[model samples]
Target: EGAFYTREYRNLFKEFGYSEAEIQERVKDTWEQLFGDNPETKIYYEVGDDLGYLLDTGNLDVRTEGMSYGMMMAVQMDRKDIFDRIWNWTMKNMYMTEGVHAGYFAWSCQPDGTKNSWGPAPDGEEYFALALFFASHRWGDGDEQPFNYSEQARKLLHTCVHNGEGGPGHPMWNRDNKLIKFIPEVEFSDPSYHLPHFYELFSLWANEEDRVFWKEAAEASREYLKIACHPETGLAPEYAYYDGTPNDEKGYGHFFSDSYRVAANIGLDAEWFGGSEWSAEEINKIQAFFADKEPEDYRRYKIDGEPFEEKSLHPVGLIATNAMGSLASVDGPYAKANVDLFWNTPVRTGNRRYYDNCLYLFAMLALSGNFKIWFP
Candidate 1:
């Protein structure tokens, strides 16, 4: 937990025998592949002078998930200009001002800036708040509306946990359970959305009164994952009930795209806050589960480890996250091999490249210790 106290991040790539220069170059090249003018692999697109968006290339639309993810990537990379442009576009296009969803952002939008859905996704809100707070710490606040980073983060977080108290909108988190909802209006949670690490930071940077709530939320999510993830396999469903049971109502009870993030989140939480024995064991199980499987043969599966007929749509992402899980494993059985595979994998191209490249870049930054907490 050196990073948690002294703020000295671990460079896993270097520890695994990669040279400093090589790791630095890999990080920079991956960023350019996603954010540069490379039409094939780029996901980020700038619109006018001060607006930009991350396209969900497969869907051909902009989503709060992608936009907030872009902001997080920008802040982590210390690219304030890119961060501002993404934030400007997000505020202009997605931030909802009226109706039951006021104070939240639309979950989906057209690339041209039209709303595809007025509802909000909790994952995006959480990432947005965390990224904005990091921006405030790293670059300080600007004088104006959207540029006022810290205040912008606080207001957004306040709305997330306090929206329904005296208003029309619903809170993103359930007050009693302290679990994040799949959407503000839903009762179930997405396993991948439970970022205890982010909530731990929010406990400090959020509004004063809400600090206690965020602190409780951090522990709540940690305990929640103990029950949500399968003990033997370490696989979690895409959507699960508050009780940690799979909510198969929408066929999301299986381990699929959204489930991959659990490993990455656990790894980061471990790096920043000291991994619990349970989390370490859990992440190791996931790494081991995919040890013998090739990315080309990756498939959907039941949480108990039963493979499905459907193949994964984001196999590169799966490889990336599995490699990221090594952060928590001191001597994991497949840790080195997983990291080696991820290092050798190239950024994906074509329609489904967006999500894959995003995860790929994040894995590269994290393993190199570049994904840091920008302290004030």
Candidate 2:
């Protein structure tokens, strides 16, 4: 139909308490309008040419981003059917072979479920695993062993940490593992990969050693944040060398600060013995830095120094900034700033797309504590 089936808006509607009748009506109408009267066979809508994107395309970040919103909606609206549909599709379509070493959800799949491309990146695996872990914790019923997703996620995370195939500092590892030089080919590490928030998940489902490993990883990542973070500005460079040096001159933009937001939020949640003692301190520093800078320096904070005037009021940045401030206990300055951005920003601009706005809506949900769980 319209973009209702796109997952983001559906979850948004769910959060706002749209009735099931109303949701179904909108989805059905949108579907019919887009693909005509036929329903089941014509589920495929074109994104481009012959490329068909699955609802769960196996990209962990996108899938879980969408799934978390969906689950949040389900919890709010008491809609098991919608939740189950998303769950089943994600499980069947997202898992990679070898059972434990899961890939990102496929970018494309044959009708018979053969993967077309594993992905252009590996961080999606982390996101997918974290999502499953949270889903099991939040919605799992002991009767159906719905929490089995957590078990699978535990195994998958182990492979990620120990196998060292696609992580930081390992040879033959993906770009996320490399130093943060502005090498165009090198994949810049995102704080999302560290997933400090997920340590509790490992503690719940894994053995002592496994728990220690995740905890250590999170700790190390926090240290890395100190290195990756700009000392004076508090903004983390979008890309860094393996040693945590900034590579801003190489064209990696500093646009998305969500990684820092996630790290700070996770640190706040993990303010106990497992995380670094400096976790809280670092978060506070970063938040304070942003708060001080947003007034005069907002225009200068661009990825690779490219002007981002069009993105001055970008909601995603607002959410990350506010969430970071909230987690860091910077009073309510960051939160007020985010709310102001939401209220003051234009609903549509030439530079900002609908999908970008959808992400902002999801970020707001995350900030509001309405987002679905990843770890128990």
Candidate 3:
């Protein structure tokens, strides 16, 4: 409860008896592995002086997902230089100005800045806006266009909510349900994209006219999460309907890669906003669901706990997010167990390191109480 108002984040690692030095070094070392020049572990690559990109190593492409995540990570780590480089690169390469997608970004681009997809993913936009706001607060906005962090964030939010009416594309969120869509053109949503915690901040920082909308969006997502997660197992689908039922359109209705974020999001929301009564209970169930499973045996699963033959592509990511979920969970036998596994697990290597490492770094920042809200 004190976290929101007091601006004090809990050091979960310290509380679990990790020495302060150990906790600090863990955070620093993880950051280095992702952003430093360790070819095997690094995802971030600095471009010509002012630009950089986070490579989706598996796909060998640049994506808004990685670019925006890089910004958030850099800002949280107080690396304004890195934040600017990622944002600069994203604006230069991804921002779309013509046709229906005007004011939105192309979701995928090649490393050389060629567009692979002309569509925008709402997750990227939401993250970009939040990261921009954090950048503006943590380090004052710059005089230039792209450097004008808060203004850029507000304009992006404005486009996200009002892009269709006076102009070309559709809004990223469904106006009727106030739920975020997987893409601006889609009716269904990805459960992992529902970030009520970010919306809560937007309600305060977005342009005044949109403030009310952000507040309603925040509440809407909170309720949406209740229905989206399975009551018994607490697992959510990768994609869901407005009513929170799984959208099986592409077989993504199962708990898989995207579903992993649900636990971490719930935990962060609880840490930042004091959380809803059931939020903690929901994450506790997730922690318990994996309490007995070894990381090597982690696999794709249905919401009710049926396992798929396919092994999890990012088992380390699952471990990290589950540990981060401890923030929202009540103390129980499974609580420390989750964190212990994450503590022992190292950041991933190989072609798929990008996404898994992103989640890993986030868990480190969060559990150590470094993932902060930079207030104005």
Candidate 4:
């Protein structure tokens, strides 16, 4: 799927004066890039140095990203064929035979339908669960939902809560079956893990007990945020010690310095947990922090307050800020500034840059409030 599967793309096409035909053309181009024009020639799996060799391997995060982009593309382009292919690929290949309790989708998968070296994590599962829920909501009939993945998702998340090693507060795995540290040192469980989105999903599909369970978990997650976030910079560290202290050696804002780190906390707040009031305040504070300083100054605001410099506008940052802004009102200057900066800024740094641009574009579409869904 093209990067357009995000809500920001929807907003862009529906609101930013792009025609449906133009959007469809771009979507088609993206599809060609993902799936080869001929199915036999397509490379379903790429064995890179990234996430240990797996079938659908890359970053396990991309699976959910694919899901989001694929589903959004299907809906927007009104293409059942594309949607079905992506859905079937994920369901048949992503799961472990041990079933949902082990988590519905393995972080990485082999093209031949084997589990990759990477183990499962919370956020990957959350994305798949949320994507399935969105699919069901967008395309399901009362008697026949599009996919029966929700039940599996509910079971998996519940297992993470109770059976999984990490207790409520710490939420990490046990080394040698003992409480060694926080959850598995997987890619997604970091401080700003976007797992809270599952709480909102649970509210939609799960029973009252499940809803309560997620709600409590979400609240606990918020508390975790308080513990993990730096009081001075308001920056959430990429990794932390078992006691919620920032890890000094592991370099703050390592992987997603420019973009993901900036908007990670905001994503947790806006997309999950009902967009807490404190989230808005924190976002405002961050924007203000960057307001007077030149863009280059962003590098100095690290987790440990060390001096580092790699200041550039990563697309995810723009997209994430836009996503958060879309949830805010048009009258709000912070939200408006986010949109303004995104459109006004240059967006060609390569390296996962387009992802944020796609997300931001969709966010703007949603904010317009004029588009109507023509669901099938």
lDDT against true structure, model 4 = 0.45
Which 10-residue window of candidate 4 scores lowest in summed lDDT?
49-58
* Cα error of candidate 1 at position 76, Å: 1.2
Q: After best superposition, candidate 1 residue 28: deviation in angstroms?
A: 0.4
State how far residue 115 of model 1 sits from its true place (Å): 0.2
Which candidate should be chosen as best, given lDDT against the real structure?
1
lDDT of 3 by residue, 1-376 (tens): 8377878998888889889999999999999999998998999999888989999999999989999999999999999999999999899999998878889999999999999988998999999999999999989999988999999999999999998899667999888888899998878889999999999999999999989999999899989989999998999999998978999888999999999999999888888888556987898788788878888999999998899999999898999888888888747567788999899999899999998999999999999999989899
Clashing pairs in 1: none
TM-score of 4: 0.64
Model 2 lDDT per residue over 81-162, tens place: 4445545554565555432234334434454445555432344455445555555666664345333666656665555444
Model 3 collision count: 0
lDDT of 4 by residue, 1-376 (tens): 1111233222333344546665455445433433433332222233232121111222323443444445454544444455555656666666554633344355555455465643554545555555555555565632432355455455654555445444322233222221212234432236645344445446556555557666665555566666566665455666565456655464543324332433543532353234556665555555554455544344534653454566534434544453344342323345555555554444233344335444443343343332223312
lDDT of 1 by residue, 192-233 (tens): 999999998999999999999999999999999999999999
Q: How are the candidates ranked when ordered by lDDT, highest leading?
A: 1, 3, 4, 2
**Pairs with steric clashes in candidate 3:** none
